[PDB]
Amino acid sequence: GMLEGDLVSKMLRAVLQSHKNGVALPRLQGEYRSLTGDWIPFKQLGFPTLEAYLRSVPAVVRIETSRSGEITCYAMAC
């Protein structure tokens, strides 16, 4: 019944909530596949990059950059 976008959001929240210190963006597709069996379908959902998809779901994921320019993704409270 759920929209593809709603299902992916729910799975991503499930991935991020396991990890108290967040997930480095380069590791995120792998950590999501570990839970779900497949990749985050960011192109399908209408985004050019995984980062652009993540920006579009701010109530699921908090983005923070590091000095190197890498993103770490945290589960947004709620």
Residues of this chain that bind its own copies (CB under 8 A): 1-4, 6-7, 21-22, 24-27, 29-30, 33, 37-39, 41-44, 49-52, 55-56, 58-59, 61-72, 76-78
Q: Site residues (CB under 5 A) for Cl ion?
A: 3-5, 23-25, 27, 41, 43-44, 49-51, 57, 59, 67-68, 70-71
16 binds, among Cl ion, its own copies, none (CB under 5 to 8 A by kind): none
Residue 9: both structure tokens together:
């959001």
Question: How many alpha carbons lie under 13 Å from residue 1 in its C-beta half-sphere?
Answer: 0
DSSP percent split of the chain into helix, strand, coil, nearest 5:
40, 15, 45
